[PDB]
Amino acid sequence: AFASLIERQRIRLLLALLFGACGTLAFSPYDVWPAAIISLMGLQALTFNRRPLQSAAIGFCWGFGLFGSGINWVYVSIATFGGMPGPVNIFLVVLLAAYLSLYTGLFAGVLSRLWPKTTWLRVAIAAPALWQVTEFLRGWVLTGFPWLQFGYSQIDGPLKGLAPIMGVEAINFLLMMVSGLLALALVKRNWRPLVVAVVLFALPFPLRYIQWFTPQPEKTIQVSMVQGDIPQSLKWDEGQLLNTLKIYYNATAPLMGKSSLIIWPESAITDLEINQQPFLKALDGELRDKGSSLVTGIVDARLNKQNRYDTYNTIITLGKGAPYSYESADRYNKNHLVPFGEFVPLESILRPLAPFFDLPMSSFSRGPYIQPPLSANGIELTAAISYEIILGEQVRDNFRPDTDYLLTISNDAWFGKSIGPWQHFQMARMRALELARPLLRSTNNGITAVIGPQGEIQAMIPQFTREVLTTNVTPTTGLTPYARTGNWPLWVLTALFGFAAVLMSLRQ
Ligand SMILES: CCCCCCCCCCCCCCCCCCCC(=O)O[C@H](COC(=O)CCCCCCCCCCCCCC)COP(=O)(O)OCCN
């Protein structure tokens, strides 16, 4: 009796959660990319033949089914490092999933208000355009949080070659268009939208065999990222500062003279750069003598015009090809700070409330949006500290044509053994794919890997293990169409589809 059961409001809301939860089965840990299409079909099929205010509830439940069932490793960072009652920890995660679901409830509500009837216009020209706008708002409002975008799920899939041409957000655009036409063919029991939903999904397949980069087997350095595996509950303690420096230095010494580039995780030196001055100067001379360059994440307290200490999450460079100096330009201050982890809203009421809102060294300051690429031993590194690697447009803007490797240092020790480090790792692979540059990802204990110029994992060391990822990586030169253009060509298509769909909605 499913013919009349589907029309009930409650049955569609509960089906929204199941199709919403099926979305998380497309990301890095469970890499079933078909689950991205099935989940998106549920968002569009379940909102068919619904009033505008009823589709918003369905869209909210689909979002809550995806962002509370696939973004819940935030609970690990709350229940293990912030001191709060258990119900309070659950409430924040639920609130985060509820907040992120508004931009999906907004999508479905507007979609069923301007395009009530179910047709190819609603699913293929209206939904992809409105999905881009609502996804953009989720990634722009309150500093944004562009997590769980189905474009990242196609890192190893048919829609792989589309990212180098128009970016990851184009895969989000195409997945929504294909899924909508796929759900239209199922609800209306038609076959013409099914054929279109296959042609649009098979045309970008040959694009994955096009290489926009020319590899250079001449600058083949031997990079070696040192995974310190420093516990997060002890990383910023005073008594661990001497120990953590010894752990990294001892592993770095055999690498000197044989590894051209050595990379340490984010905030590897937990002390202020001005405080740890003699250690860096002594380390710089040893690295330069043997012919090795070190890239390190450190905390800085650079002075400002107002003579106020503005703490920055920086990257310093030492050794050959980049002499270390406190006034050197080979730095990278972190720009997009993580909310509630690096900055606290208004820093006035929330911080005294709970220890979670007052984390060790969580009063950072933003840096310039565009910064020069790091230079180390004659290679240009485009840095992106941790969270910044998920921001495709910010990385592209800093991406100079002379960049040899994409650099990313992260500290994923917060999110336990959960799927958070993997989802973050999958997004980092997308940057290498669309910019056609090798990605040298280094983490405290997370997934340390050398992503190839196509999103392939050239090397990786086991997680939660204090190891060193010594490997040979060949830099690539060449500009992808995404690097040369960016997000504007997609927004023209969004505006072209959005303006050609709103007018056809006001016509009737
Ligand atoms: C009406 C709406 C109001 C807000 C609704 C939301 C509800 C708020 C409460 C729920 C959200 C809580 C999020 C807590 C995240 C804490 C984990 C951050 C730890 C961290 O920053 O580590 C850094 C690594 O970056 C990373 O590894 C980044 C990993 C990916 C981001 C993690 C999740 C971010 C969630 C952002 C939520 C934004 C909501 C609004 C859009 C570097 O760490 P370090 O070693 O340098 O040490 C520095 C410690 N100070």
UniProtKB/Swiss-Prot annotation:
TM segment ranges: 9-26, 33-47, 52-67, 86-115, 120-140, 168-188, 191-209, 487-507
Compartment(s): Cell inner membrane
EC primary class: transferase
Cytoplasmic side stretches: 1-8, 48-51, 116-119, 189-190
The entry's keywords: Acyltransferase, Cell inner membrane, Cell membrane, Membrane, Transferase, Transmembrane, Transmembrane helix
A single Gene Ontology CC term: outer membrane-bounded periplasmic space
Chain coiled-coil ranges: none
InterPro entries attached to this UniProt entry: Apolipo_AcylTrfase, C-N_Hydrolase, C-N_Hydrolase_sf, LNT_N
Domain of life: Bacteria
Residues in CN hydrolase domain copies: 226-475
GO terms under biological process: lipoprotein biosynthetic process
Pathway where this protein functions: Protein modification; lipoprotein biosynthesis (N-acyl transfer)
Any one GO molecular function term: N-acyltransferase activity
Variant or mutagenesis effect after changing residue 338 to G: Loss of activity
Main location: membrane
EC number: 2.3.1.269
Result after altering residue 415 to A: Loss of activity
Name of a matching Pfam family: LNT_N
UniProt function note: Catalyzes the phospholipid dependent N-acylation of the N-terminal cysteine of apolipoprotein, the last step in lipoprotein maturation. Utilizes a two-step reaction via a ping-pong mechanism. Lnt undergoes covalent modification in the presence of phospholipids, resulting in a thioester acyl-enzyme intermediate. It then transfers the acyl chain to the amine group of the N-terminal diacylglyceryl-modified cysteine of apolipoprotein, leading to the formation of mature triacylated lipoprotein.
Subunit structure and binding partners: Monomer.
Family: Belongs to the CN hydrolase family. Apolipoprotein N-acyltransferase subfamily.
Protein name: Apolipoprotein N-acyltransferase
Lineage, highest ranks first: Bacteria, Pseudomonadati, Pseudomonadota, Gammaproteobacteria, Enterobacterales
